[PDB]
Each structure stands twice: as C-alpha cells, then as structure tokens.
C-alpha cells in the first residue's frame, strides 16, 4: 500500500575566479582603505553576454565589488607593488547607489595579477560586442 512519506547569480557563467584583496582610494584622507578580501569572479550574463566583476567578502559574503568591466577601463600598476592593479570605476553598486571609485586589487602573486589582467581585457572585448 502507498505509505505517504514525511543570490542573483544563477543566470551567469563564471569566466574567471581568483583570490584578491580590494582597496578603494580615499582622496580626502589621501590613502588606500581596504574594502574586502575574497573571491573575485568574472560573471557573464547569459541573456546579455555582459561581463561584470562580483567580489564577496569571506565569511560574511557581503559584496565589496559589483560593476561592469567597461571597455574604456584601463589597468595601471601601483608604485609599491608588482602584484596589483589600479583603475577608476564610474558605477559600482556594492553598497547600493552607483558610486564612482578608484579601485586597487592585489593578488597572491605576480602570476595571478598578470592572469587577471589578461582575463580583464578579454572581458572588455566581450562587453564591446
């Protein structure tokens, strides 16, 4: 007899993942301030094919970066590091309102930094099309 028994990321592909620490430059105070440490992901939207950066903090999983990898963004080195990149971002919605930031992102090694730069530019060509 029949006995009866008792994140908004699902539509995106992960193009690239890497551990990193994200900084944002405070112009007034004139210094870098950490914003989060965790996995930095490149997410391509399957509907629009637009690629973005999404980075969450370890443990709390709060978003510390969420913005399109604009084709006009440019990665520059920081004077005191060979495993970091700095660039300006005009619309990041990690904390809500689309603010503008000068970001810096540092990685475990120069290799991971250079690879990040390669994937960052690949994503910029995708967003171009």
């Amino acid at each position: 007899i029949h006995f009866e028994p008792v994140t908004m990321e699902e539509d995106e592909e992960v193009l690239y993942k890497v551990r990193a620490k994200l900084f944002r430059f405070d112009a007034d105070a004139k210094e870098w301030k950490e914003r989060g440490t965790g996995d930095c992901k490149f997410l391509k939207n399957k509907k629009t094919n637009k690629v973005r950066i999404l980075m969450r903090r370890d443990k709390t999983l709060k978003i510390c970066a969420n913005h399109i990898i604009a084709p006009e963004y440019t990665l520059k080195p920081n004077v005191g590091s060979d495993r970091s990149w700095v660039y300006a971002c005009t619309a990041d919605i990690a904390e809500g309102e689309a603010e503008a930031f000068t970001f810096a992102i540092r990685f475990g090694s120069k290799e991971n930094a250079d690879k990040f730069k390669e994937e960052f530019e690949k994503a910029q060509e995708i967003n171009k099309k």
Binding site: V79, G80, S81, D82
Partner: protein, 1001 residues
Amino acid sequence: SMEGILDFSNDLDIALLDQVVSTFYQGSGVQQKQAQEILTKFQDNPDAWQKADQILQFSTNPQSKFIALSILDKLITRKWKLLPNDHRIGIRNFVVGMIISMCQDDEVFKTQKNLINKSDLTLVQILKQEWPQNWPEFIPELIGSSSSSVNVCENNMIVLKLLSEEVFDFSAEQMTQAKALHLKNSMSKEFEQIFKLCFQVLEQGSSSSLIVATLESLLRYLHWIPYRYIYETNILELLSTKFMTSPDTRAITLKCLTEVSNLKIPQDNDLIKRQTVLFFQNTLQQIATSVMPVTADLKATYANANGNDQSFLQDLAMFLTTYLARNRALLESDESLRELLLNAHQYLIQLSKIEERELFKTTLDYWHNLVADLFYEPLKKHIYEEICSQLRLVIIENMVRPEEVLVVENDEGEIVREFVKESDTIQLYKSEREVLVYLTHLNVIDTEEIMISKLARQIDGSEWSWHNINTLSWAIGSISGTMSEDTEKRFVETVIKDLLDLCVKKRGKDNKAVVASDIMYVVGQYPRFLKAHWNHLRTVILKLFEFMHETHEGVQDMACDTFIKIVQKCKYHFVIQQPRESEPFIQTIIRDIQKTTADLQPQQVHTFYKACGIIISEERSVAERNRLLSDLMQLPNMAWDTIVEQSTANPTLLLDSETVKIIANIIKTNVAVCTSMGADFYPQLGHIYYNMLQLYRAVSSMISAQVAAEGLIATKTPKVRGLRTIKKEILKLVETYISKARNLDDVVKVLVEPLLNAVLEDYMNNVPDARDAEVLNCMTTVVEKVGHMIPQGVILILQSVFECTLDMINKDFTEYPEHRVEFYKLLKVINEKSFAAFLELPPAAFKLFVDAICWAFKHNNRDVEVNGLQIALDLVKNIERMGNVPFANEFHKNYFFIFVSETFFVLTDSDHKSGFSKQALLLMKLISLVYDNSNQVYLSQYLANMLSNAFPHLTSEQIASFLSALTKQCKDLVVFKGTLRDFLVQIKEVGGDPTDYLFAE
C-alpha cells in the same frame, strides 16, 4: 534648541531634559548624536548634581532619572567630603524616599527595575561614605522594614547584594586599605542579623521574585561569610532540594552550591563531610527527577537551545566539575556512595559530547584533573574504568586538527591548504592529547581496541568519511609514547597498511590529499618506530620526496614540514652508514637535492636545507662535517661565486629584479642552514663573509641613490624593498651565527670589525625612512655575546645609532615602531654589559640618555615601557656600584630628582597602569638610596612641594602622612605598593583620611 538645558543661569526645563534624553536613546542619526554631546556636557557640569533632586520627582523619563543618579554617583564618589552636612543629609533623604516610593507603586516596582537598581546602587555609594559611623541603625532598620512589604523586602535583598559586592568583591582597587577593612568589619559585625532575615524568607517565602533576589544576595555572601552559616544551619538542605525544583530559582541555586562546592573543608570534621555529601546527593536527585535522567542526550538538548537549557547545562558542568575536583574523595570509599559518584561522572560524559568549544574545554579541564589523579593515586582507577572507557571514545571522536596538518575542507567540499593558522585550537589539541595519553596509560589495551575497531569500520566503508578518518588518525598520532615498543610496532604497522589501502581505494585528489595528510602526521609522530626499522625510515623519506613534486600545495608543504620533523628525531640514522647501504643517507639526499626540491617554493627549499643542516651537525668529525657542509652549499655557493663576479663587474645588474631575488634566496639559504648548525656553520660563513659585506655596501649605495632620484616613495617600490631584503638577510645571518657561536674569540677578532665598518656609518648617514631597524637588533646580539670584549666597539655603536635614532622616536609614540623597540633593547644590554660606554658620553649626550629613559616610561607600548623602567633600575644600580666618586655625585645632583618626579608622574597619571609594579620598584630603589646616605630632609621637602603643586586638592597633612608612610616602607615592597595604591585612590577624591596611611603601622 536642545542646548537650553546646558545654560544653568536660567532654571532647568525638565520637560526639555526629558526630550533630549528621549532623542538620544529612541532617536537616530544626527539628532541622536547631537543629543549625546549635550547630555555628556550636562553631566560634566560640576553643578549638575544640584538638579538631581528636582529631576527625580518632576521627571517622566526613567532614563533622565537614571542619568540624574549617575550625576549624584560622581559627586558621592569624588566630592562627598567637602559637601556641607546640609546637602549630605538631604541627598540621603530623597534617595531613600525615592526608593520607598517605587516599592509602594507596584507598577513602577515592576516596570522600572533599571531605575530601582541604579537608585539602590547610589544608596550603596552613600553607605560606603557614611555607614556605619554616621548611620548605625541602617541594618536594623532595613530588617524592620522588610516585614512591612514584600516589595520592600525584595529590594532590600538587592541593596545588600550590591553592598556585599562593593565591599568584598570590588573594593581592592577602589578604596584605601583602611576604608576597605572598615567596611568589611562593619558588615561582618551585623551579618548575623542579615543571615537570619535571609534564612527566614527562604524558609517561609512564596514570592519567587523575592526568593530569587534573596538567593542572589546569598551568592555574594558565600564569597566571605564564616563556614558555620553554611553547614551549621539548614540552608544547604533548602538549596539542594527546595530551590532545585523550581526553574526560576534553579540557576542561582546551582551557582550558590558551586561556591559552596569550591570551599576547602576542614578534613577532620565528619559533620561537614557528611553535609558536603548530602547537598550533592540531593542536587543530583532533583536533577534526575525534575530536569532530565542520566541517559538524556544533552548534546541534542544544547543544540536545540530552548529556553535556558544552554545556560543550565553550562552551570551544571561548572557545578559538577567544581564539586568533584574538590570532594570526589568523599564518595570513593563508601560503597553506598558509589552509584552517586558514577552518576555524576556519567552526566559529565553526556555534557562532554555537546558541540561547544568553550564548554568542552571546561569538562576537558576536569577530565585532566581526574585521569592525572588516577595516574598517580593508588587503588582509584578501577573505580572509573567504565567512565574512562566512554571518555576514550569521546576524545577520539572529537580530536581537533593539530597544527602539523595543513589541509582543510572549504565551503565547496574541496580539500585546500589552510589560509590562516588556527591558533585558538592548538591549545585545545594539546589538552586533548594530555588527557588521551593518560587514558591510554590507564588501559593501553582498551585504547588499542577502540582505535583498531574504528580503523576497521573505515576500511569496510561502513563509517568512511573525511571527518571520521581525520579524528582517528589524529588520535592515533597523539598517543605516541604510551605503548611498548613491540605493541607500538604492530600497532603502527597495522595503521600504515590500512591507511595505504584507503589511499588506493579512495580516488580523486580530494580523497588523496586527506589520507596523505593523515599518514604524514601519523608517521611524523612515531619516530621510535622509524628508527627501529631503517627500511621503513628510508621508504618514508623517499615518499616525502615524491610528495614534494605534488601539485596540491597542501601535500607539498606538509611533506617538507614532516621531513624536518622526522629529521629532528632520527638525525643520527642519516649520518651513519646503514647495513646494505653504500654511504650515509645524507650523502644521497645532498646528491639529488636539486631534483628533489625542483618544484618547491623558496621558503620550502630553505626548510629542506635547514633539515640537512640538522643532520650534518650530528657528524662530530670536523673534517667530515665540513665536507658535508661544503657539499650541501654547492648550489648556493656556485650562484654566489657567479654573482660576485658580476656585482664587481657592473653593479647595474643589481637593478635586475631576478638577480636581487637570487641573491636574497642564496642568503636566506645560508640563514636556514646556520639556524640549525650554529657554531658548526663558521666554515661556510668564512667562505662568503668578506664578499657578503661588500655586497651589503653596494646594495646600500643603490638604495640611497634610488631614494634621492625618486624620493622617499622609492622605499615602497619592489626594487628597493628587494634590495633592503638583502641587507636584512645579511644582518640576520650574522646575528644568527653570533648568537650561537662557541668560539667568541674569532667573533671579535674576525667578524666584529668588518661588520661595524659596513653597517654603522651606512645606518647613520641614511635618511630615517631608509634606516633598517635590523641593524639595531643585530648590534644588540653583538653586545649580548661579546660586548664585554669590545669596549671600543660598544662606544662606536653608540655614536652611530644613539642620537640619530632618538631623533626618530622622540617626537611621538607612533612612528618607527620597530626602531623604537630595538633601540631600547640595545640600550638595555649596553647598560648591563658595557655601562662604561655611557661614561664616555659627553655631558650633553648623557643628558639625552636620561631623557631617553624617561621617554620610554611614558610609552603605553609594553615592548618599550618595560625596557625603559628596567634601564632606569639598572642605571641606578650601576651608579651605586661606582661608590662615592665625582660622576656618582654629579649624577645625583643632575638626574636623581628627575627620575623621582618622572617615575611619580607615570605612577599617578592613570595612563600607565600596566607598569605599576616596576614603577613602584624603581621608586622604592630611588627613595632607599637617600635613606642610606640630612639628605633625607631635602627629599621630603622636594617630594612635599612636588606633590603639592601636582595635586593641589590634597591637604598638607595628606601629603605629609603619605610621605611619612612611604619613606618608612622603602624596604617592604608589598607594603610600599599598598601605600601607593592608597595614594592613587585618594587623588581621585577630595578629603581622603590621612590616617589611612597608618594602615601597615
């Protein structure tokens, strides 16, 4: 708007105050913030206390009345003495009336417990000032009013609770010794009446709220009251039966019995013994019948976290462990108590299964207390054999990850290398190992049976899992040393065979990494086994070498740590020639070193070389050891010889990022080998020393040049950071060898002279941001080891580093934290080992030395503050040694009274309390110098005048009495410190009793 409250010229608008308070608490944003700064200033007004009376009877906001009582609290604490008796009697009257008022309004008494507790506390502040000298009837009146109202009775229990705390629990560093003893003697004199009241409501009280408050005050009394009030009355029967049945009284009742349970009982009294057994027998009974039986699953109850179950289980664990650690012997001899003894321990077994780190630590501490006693105490372990057998299961199943195990599972279910070091579980693992080692010694057969059986259910798969195989492997490794060599042999053999079978059966790099880490840890823990079977040792090492090529960085890193871990214990088996071998194994290792370490990271390569050094140092034939050392260093020496040809050719190559990195790793390799070889490293050091110091100079030029051409930011660039790394590794290498050198003659005759010429001037002539604090750390080690042999060398060190480093750190307590710390470590050792160097300083520089010692006094940083006070103490000793000579006389004329005043400043400024003990020691030393040679009259004159201007609110008599007591006690440090703490208490208030300084008289 909200500031009209601050203007005291006009009257206070209580309706406005009530709204400012409401905005601060119930508000938000700037409105809340502004109301905060306003309420703070209103409270800080020296006259705000005058508005307390009206607020307490015309306010509707309980918070306003709370802040009012806080304002009165400040006054009662600091200025009650200067208060005319007009206000003192009045403030008492409306605080008392306010209390009576609230106890009559059943609504207020119920809803505003915060304001009643605060009021009660403010009353206790008055009692500290006026009772019993100016209020001898407070207690008999409090007891009389108890019968008038149940609310009055309950609240009086709160007052007496806060009173007992302020007098016995928190009086040490808040009153003078005299006042504390006065209040303790007062309560002790009238406690008989307090207890009779407390006991009467406990026997005839139905109001739970009253019963609880009475039990709350009882908990405080148990901290100090005579034992007779505990055992000669019926109260233990009440606590252990009546009050354990009602949940609202169970928590506080259990805490009360915990206090009782910790008391040391006069072992000669049989009535207390029988009474100590009784309240424990009753308590366990009430728990088994009213809360849960001994078979209950406390693990599940705690996880569900219903009501106060978590807090109750914590209190039960505290009660059982406290009582049993003290009185379990009372239960071990009598057969009628055996079931009670084991039932209590069974509850602890169930408590030990709870998933709660801190609670487990609490039970684990008790288990340690027990198994250690069963290890040494005759005829006891057979009693607990069933308890211990269960406990072996508990510990084995809850083994935490030891530090050697470097793999962990993440949120994706993948085995990765650990990001951080779990520092807060290292101690837990060592506690678990200690207990499990004892348990294994108490029955080695039972422990092998459990572990082998668990290992079987891992093979067949019925219980396979990463967590289950980990805890088992960790437990197996942890009990190393408890079995006989023959038992261990077959036990380890069986463990390896089964862990290897798992490595085969389990596929996928995740499963492979788990087992790899488990076998490496087990093997590293049983060196005695590896020693006894060369075939086994050799196979392990060669498999570790294989793992050094594994792509999983976790396996790779642990293989190197395990290698060196095994070498530290089996080093001897690597230098001898084993049968069936052509050469010592160290020969084979060195030979293939390039292949073996090809895939390793520099840090890991250096660990490998360090392990090799450990082995080489076992060869006590100088010729063979030096030959092995030369073979080991072949690769770094070839790269070193090549690079010195190029650094000589064109120093432009050092701009090459890769050349810099190669140099640093060569030196890091020499550092690693020197760390493990010590004095035996001297040959390899002589091979590179002179050229290494030349490289140090050339690197210094590039750093200086880069800064001038690019600015101070150059110090942050990778290029300069890499060049500075070279310099720091060279100093580290020289510092490592000197600290371990046996032949101090060659150090002085060969190394010191070139070293100082290479590092001192460079340090002195660099800009601050380019000076390496490692120079100071290195010079400290030089002076520590050969300082007594180079008087002119110590002097040269001072001239180069003293003044230029002091100017870096004497502008605040922040910048250059490393130089700050190393600077005073260097002065510390110089003052001890070569104080003569300070006598050569011109009077101006010696004045900077004194200014620098006192500068360290004022640091909050303990690394600096401690060394500053020690230098002062040792500098005084050094002067006293000199006897009565001009320098000593001049020192006392110029600097004695500086140290006195500077020491007194940090003692009394309330911002350097961490160094109180050493401050007092130094002050006692300074004073005692004068009372041995008048010179004593002037010292009192100076001190009296100093304290008068520094603490103008003290009377002349207070200062006079304090100095009279302080100068008599400059040979009794315990009493000397008690007098200072009395002084620190009196400077926080007005009108302190000067007779308090006769306490020790």
